[PDB]
Write a protein that binds this ligand. Structure first.
Ligand SMILES: O=P(O)(O)OC[C@H]1O[C@H](O)[C@@H](O)[C@@H](O)[C@@H]1O
Ligand SMILES: [Mg+2]
Length: 290
């Protein structure tokens, strides 16, 4: 079967003996890539991560999430030191930590732009779907089934605040948890209004994230590789969503998971197993020989 294979653009399996780069470090998206559809690390993936640690391969989370929600989803693994959150790439790069928890990237949204996005969101009536991200906390203006759905998957609940409190907050990103029915049009409206102003990414399902326009996960990847004196050619990125495209196309070695959109797969060097098929386990086997 094709379930566990990794192949190049021509559909040929990638072979270890044809690789000329040692892979020292793996950057992975969490939801949709490392985590299966139940938001869990599969046992096969876990087993391979244990081997990766034994061999000194670094595995770095690269996510739109804050480090706080990541710890809420995978905390049992973090507590056992099976997955390290420091260094890590959070909020799509806008908060990137080194191993001491220092921010090697801190990209705060300009406050005028924040308020312009806020007012625009109230004008097109998606403000009720907004989750605003400060460094340590998240905020929303109400709770509805879309906010509920975000809370369930995110596993970290925003505080409910009044509209007028946003002005005083210092924010990195906003995430809109949208109804499916308005996603496509809302995405168009945000991209037309905010081009050359902010990044606009449809990250998972109906979620739309806006974050500093010059930052993305690959910027985080470069800083963490720099930290460890690792050439980009010794790094591999794996991902599923729009917010992974820069890191997949920026690294010579990159793997889109089978469940990714064609657009995301196009940006990646190789296509691997789906997130439900233990993708990092097979990446580790192919690139690192386990
Ligand atoms: O960046 P990652 O780790 O792939 O996860 C991204 C996803 O995280 C969670 O599932 C949600 O917040 C989604 O809105 C988001 O798209
Ligand atoms: Mg993802």
């Amino acid at each position: 079967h094709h379930m566990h294979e990794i192949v190049d653009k021509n559909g040929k399996k990638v072979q270890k003996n044809n690789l000329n780069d040692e892979i020292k470090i793996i950057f992975t998206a969490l939801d949709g890539t490392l985590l299966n559809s139940e938001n869990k690390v599969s046992e096969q993936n876990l087993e391979s991560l244990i081997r990766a640690q034994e061999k000194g391969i670094k595995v770095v989370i690269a996510t739109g999430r804050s480090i706080f929600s990541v710890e809420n989803v995978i905390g049992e693994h973090v507590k056992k030191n099976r997955i390290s959150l420091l260094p890590g790439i959070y909020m799509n790069g806008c908060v990137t930590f080194d191993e001491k928890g220092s921010r090697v990237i801190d990209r705060i949204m300009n406050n005028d732009l924040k308020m312009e996005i806020h007012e625009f969101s109230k004008q097109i009536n998606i403000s009720k779907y907004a989750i605003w991200f400060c460094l340590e906390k998240t905020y929303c203006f109400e709770i509805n089934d879309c906010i509920r759905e975000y809370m369930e998957v995110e596993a970290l609940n925003p505080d409910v605040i009044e509209d007028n409190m946003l002005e005083g907050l210092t924010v990195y990103k906003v995430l809109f948890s949208l109804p499916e029915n308005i996603l496509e049009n809302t995405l168009k409206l945000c991209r037309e209004k905010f081009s050359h102003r902010i990044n606009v990414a449809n990250t998972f399902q109906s979620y739309v994230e806006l974050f500093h326009q010059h930052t993305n996960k690959f910027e985080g990847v470069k800083e963490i590789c720099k930290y460890y004196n690792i050439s980009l050619n010794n790094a591999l990125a794996m991902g599923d969503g729009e917010n992974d495209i820069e890191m997949l196309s920026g690294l010579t070695h990159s793997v889109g998971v089978h469940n990714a959109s064609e657009k995301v797969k196009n940006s990646a060097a190789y296509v691997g197993p789906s997130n439900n098929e233990h993708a990092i386990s097979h990446v580790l086997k192919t690139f690192c020989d386990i």
